[PDB]
Specification:
3 domains, time-resolved crystallography, mainly alpha, binds chloride ion, DNA Cyclobutane Dipyrimidine Photolyase, subunit A, domain 3, about 475 residues, Serine Threonine Protein Phosphatase 5, Tetratricopeptide repeat, flavoprotein, binds flavin-adenine dinucleotide, Rossmann fold, monomeric, 5 strands, five-stranded parallel β-sheet
Amino acid sequence: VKNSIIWFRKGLRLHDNPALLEACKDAKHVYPVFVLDPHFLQQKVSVNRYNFLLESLEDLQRSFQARGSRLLVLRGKPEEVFPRVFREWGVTQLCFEHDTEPYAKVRDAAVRRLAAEAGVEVVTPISHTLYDTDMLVARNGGAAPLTMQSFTKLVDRVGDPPAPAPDPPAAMPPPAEDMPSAAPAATGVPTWQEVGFKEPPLTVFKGGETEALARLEAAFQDPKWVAGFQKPDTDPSAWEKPATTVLSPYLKFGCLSARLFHARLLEVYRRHPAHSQPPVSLRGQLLWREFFYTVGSTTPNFHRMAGNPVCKQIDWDDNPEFLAAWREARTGFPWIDAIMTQLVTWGWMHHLARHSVACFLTRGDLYVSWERGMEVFEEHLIDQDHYLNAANWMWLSASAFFSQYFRVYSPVVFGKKYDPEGRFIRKFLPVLKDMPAKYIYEPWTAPLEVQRKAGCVVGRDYPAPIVDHAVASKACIARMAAAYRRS
Ligand SMILES: Cc1cc2nc3c(=O)[nH]c(=O)nc-3n(C[C@H](O)[C@H](O)[C@H](O)COP(=O)(O)OP(=O)(O)OC[C@H]3O[C@@H](n4cnc5c(N)ncnc54)[C@H](O)[C@@H]3O)c2cc1C
Ligand SMILES: [Cl-]
C-alpha cells in the first residue's frame, strides 16, 4: 500500500501545497507531521513569533480535523524522529516543500539519505517562492542578478510564475489507528506556557492560514488601492490601519502562498491598465522577496560581513552602550523609541519605520554593526526571514545593494512629515501622551514648565537624547566616505 508523510516546516497551509497533493495521491494513510524541538528555548526568539507559529499549527490542526485527519506535532529532531516513524508507519513517500536556507540545506540532505536507507521516495516541490530560484540563476548565465533592474528583466523574460496548486480533497486519508508515536498526548499542539515562556504575547496579528486568507481578501476589497500601490509613498505612522498589507508574517511561515498573492495581483492588473509597475508596486514587493532569496541562496556567508563577497567591509564600532540604548528603546528620540517599542510589542513595523531605526543604529548616528541590529530584529520580528532580514540590513547600512551614504534620515523630522501631532508616539510611548505637539519629537527642547505640566521631565521620566544628530551624522558620513574610498 502507500503510506505517506507530508512534512511541514514552512508552507503551513492547505492551499497551493503541491507537496500535500502528492502526499494524498493514492495514499492509504497520510501523516501530517511538524517536528518540534522542545529544547529550543534552552539553546533568541520572542514569544510573539513563537506563539504566532503555535497559532499557525492550531489552524492546520482544525483544518485537518475538518477533513478526517489530524496534525502530528512530533517532539525531537528530524534526524532522530524520522528513521523511527518511517518503519513504524510503513512510509513509502516523504513530501515537503523545498527550502533554500543554509540550515535547511544541511537538514534536508540528512533526511534525504535517511529516507533512502528506508526505501522512501522523497518529493520536494518548490512553492515557498514564486519561481525556481535555481532556474533563475541558470537562465541568467549561471550567476544571480545583483540589481533589482536586472532581476526584473530576467523574470519578465522567464514569464508568469506557476499557477497556484488546486485545493486538497475534502476528505484525507487519516493516520493509521493505534500507532505509538502518533498518540494524541505526545503529538498535540502546545501552548506558549507549556514550552517555557513566562510573559504572554502582546502582538495583534494572529497566526494561521485562515487569518492569512482573510487579510488577503481585505486587501483586495479596494482594487484601486491595490493597482495604484506605491511602496515609497506609504505612511509609516499609520498604526490603527497600517498603510501596507501586513502579510509578511504569513508569507514567512508559509501561511499564505506567494503564487496565490501573485495571481490575485495579475487579476487586478488586467482590469487596471494604469497600475503601478515594479519596484514600487505590490507585485514589485513580492519581487523584492524573490530577488533577495535568489541572491542570498547563491552567496556564502550572506547573513554575515566577514567572508561575504557581496558585503563591504566596514570597521563598525563595538559600542555596547549605544546598542543597549537602541535595543531598549531609550535613545531619547521619541520617533526612534516608539518604533523600537512597536518592535517588541507587535513584532511588526512599517518598512520606512524599519528604515529609521536601522539607519540610526548604523551609518546614520551610532555606527554600530548591522549584524548586531539584525540580531535584535531576528528575536522580535514575527516576520523574521533569514534572507530578507539580512539583505535589508545590509541595504540600510550601505554595505550592499545600496551605496548612497549621504542620504541620512533625521530621527526628528522624518516622522513629523507624516504625523505632526505624534499620534504614533503617544500610542507606543504613553509617558509622552500629554506633551504638546510642538515638542513631542524633541522633548529636550520643551521648557521645564511644559515638561512638568505634561508630566514628562526629560532625564527623570524620559531619557535625554544619547547623541546630537547634527554631530553624530557628520562623523558617520565622513567615516563611510573613507570606507568607500578604500575599495
Ligand atoms: C532592516 C530591515 C529588516 C527587514 N527584515 C525583514 C524580515 O525579517 N522579514 C520580512 O518579511 N521583511 C523584512 N524587511 C522588509 C520590509 O520591511 C517588510 O517586508 C515589510 O515591512 C512587510 O510589510 P507588509 O507585509 O505590509 O509588506 P507589503 O508592502 O505589503 O509587501 C508585501 C510583501 O512583499 C514582501 N516585501 C515587501 N517589502 C520587502 C522588502 N523590502 N524586501 C523583501 N521583501 C519585501 C514581503 O513578503 C511583504 O509581506 C526588512 C526591512 C528592513 C529595512
Ligand atoms: Cl529625513
